UniProtKB/Swiss-Prot annotation, chain B:
Any Gene Ontology biological process: white fat cell differentiation
Organism: Homo sapiens (Human)
Span of the entire protein shown here: 235 to 503 of 505
Record keywords: Activator, Biological rhythms, Cytoplasm, Diabetes mellitus, Disease variant, DNA-binding, Glycoprotein, Isopeptide bond, Metal-binding, Nucleus, Obesity, Phosphoprotein, Receptor, Transcription, Transcription regulation, Ubl conjugation, Zinc, Zinc-finger
Record gene name: PPARG
Protein name: Peroxisome proliferator-activated receptor gamma
Tissue: Highest expression in adipose tissue. Lower in skeletal muscle, spleen, heart and liver. Also detectable in placenta, lung and ovary.
GO terms under cellular component: chromatin; cytosol; intracellular membrane-bounded organelle; nucleoplasm; nucleus; receptor complex; RNA polymerase II transcription regulator complex
Length: 264, 261
């Protein structure tokens, strides 16, 4: 199908583009989280949150007065930013911009949720999550302690991330894996599935070789990573069901109509 | 890590046990569905009266209920066949007893829909050990919530069947599903994942030898476990609607235990 040297070329192409499109790489985030590097400002309670916004000025925690909502909303602000970074990255995947324009939009629409969850694990450990390009760190305990349903909104993301991180993928692995997710030929409404699965076949070959060369001791890591695509689809659907319960319950949630449109 | 000849021995073992455990194979089912055989033609059920004639030929309540009850009777039989097969998977019966139960609890339904695809084409499904064939249209036309019970299984089967797996492939794939270390409540994840590693190596080699032109079939088959998980969840939500609506309607004790939690 594809020759080994071409698969290495595709892997390197995707890695180079992944570094340019995403500001905070997994390699950099792990340096911050482990204490192996300007320590980030830590948000662990209500007062430290108040000081963090006053001193660091986090752009997702600014002008809807209740903290739990403010944080919940802040997460959606960052997610919308991440969609644009993922969209730019996808343009670098060989073949993608040659696809039918509606199919490109469909692949991004249904794939960004899975990729956001995947890449959020890079920024997490069992104790919290990096924010604002790594300058802040919000503790798991503070997040889980948010009232009513907002506390239980955050914890599932940590539970997935802890399991996903046990695979010990690095950025060069993740760049191919993210590409594989985007090129899923089973998204609803696709007009021309054939070139999408043709590209995914190439990407899967490149991921397989990448994993054997970069983790030669990690038996069947390729298979195990593919099994995580089950966890991703399952958690996205759960996430959707969680929002719908918020939307139908919480009357303090309204933003400026123009803001509501941006985050539709 | 395992040797090539050891992986071929494991595939042959599993295929052998699969033939012993499941009376209606994919190979037999396809001979029935494709026809050109006067000794294996099924009686076709497409409406009430042909169902009426079916009782006499294949051998007191509402039709949609009788059909539903029939599936649960067959589901219990399938759980029995699947449990027999699992005991033959090297290492399974050596596991902690609670884990054996847990793997079966969460695995039997994913396997049932996998092997049900073998009995399906786009127009209907074989029943009663291949003697009957019930049309998709007739099933979809059942009243209440029962009409929508089967259609998602058909939608999966049509896609899954496009992979063109045979029984020797499916024997390893089914084993991989059972030995899933991510089932909730498992006590000893590590020995389960050691077994699945061997099974995954064996499935990979099997697919390369038996489908050499079918690029990345291994990867594409594993992505199908996502479709399986979704169908189980849909089915469970349908049962709960039934439990709260049909209060004269009982489930088999074996089935009730599987669906608890
Ligand atoms: O930098 C990043 O790469 C980054 C990306 C995403 C998120 C985040 N998004 N969301 S989300 O809005 O629910 C959402 C929306 C659409 C689709 C998926 C999701 C989601 F999968 F993740 F669940 C979150 C919910 C909980 C948590 Cl802990 C994180 C997120 C992110 O959070 C950083 C953050 C944390 C606290 C306060 C402010 C910012 C960072």
């Amino acid at each position: 199908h594809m020759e080994s040297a071409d698969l290495r070329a595709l892997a390197k192409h995707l890695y180079d583009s992944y570094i340019k499109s995403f500001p905070l790489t997994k390699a950099k985030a792990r340096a911050i989280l482990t204490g192996k590097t300007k320590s980030p400002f830590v948000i662990y309670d209500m007062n430290s949150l108040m000081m963090g916004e006053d001193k660091i000025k986090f752009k997702h925690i600014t002008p809807s007065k209740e903290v739990a909502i403010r944080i919940f909303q802040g997460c959606q602000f960052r997610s919308v930013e991440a969609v644009q970074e993922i969209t730019e990255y996808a343009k670098s995947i060989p073949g993608f911009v040659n696809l039918d324009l509606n199919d490109q939009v469909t692949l991004l629409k249904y794939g960004v949720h899975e990729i956001i969850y995947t890449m959020l694990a890079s920024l997490m450990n069992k104790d919290g999550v990096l924010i604002s390009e790594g300058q802040g760190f919000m503790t798991r305990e503070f997040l889980k302690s948010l009232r009513k349903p907002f506390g239980d909104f955050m914890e599932p993301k940590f539970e997935f991330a802890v399991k996903f991180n046990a695979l010990e993928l690095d950025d060069s692995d993740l760049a191919i894996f993210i590409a594989v997710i985007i090129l899923s030929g089973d998204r609803p409404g696709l007009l021309n599935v054939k070139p999408i699965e043709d590209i995914q076949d190439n990407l899967l070959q490149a991921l397989e070789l990448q994993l054997k060369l970069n983790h030669p001791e990690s038996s069947q890591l390729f298979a195990k990573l593919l099994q995580k695509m089950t966890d991703l689809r399952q958690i996205v659907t759960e996430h959707v069901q969680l929002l719908q319960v918020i939307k139908k319950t919480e009357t303090d949630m309204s933003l400026h109509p123009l803001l509501q449109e941006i985050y539709k």
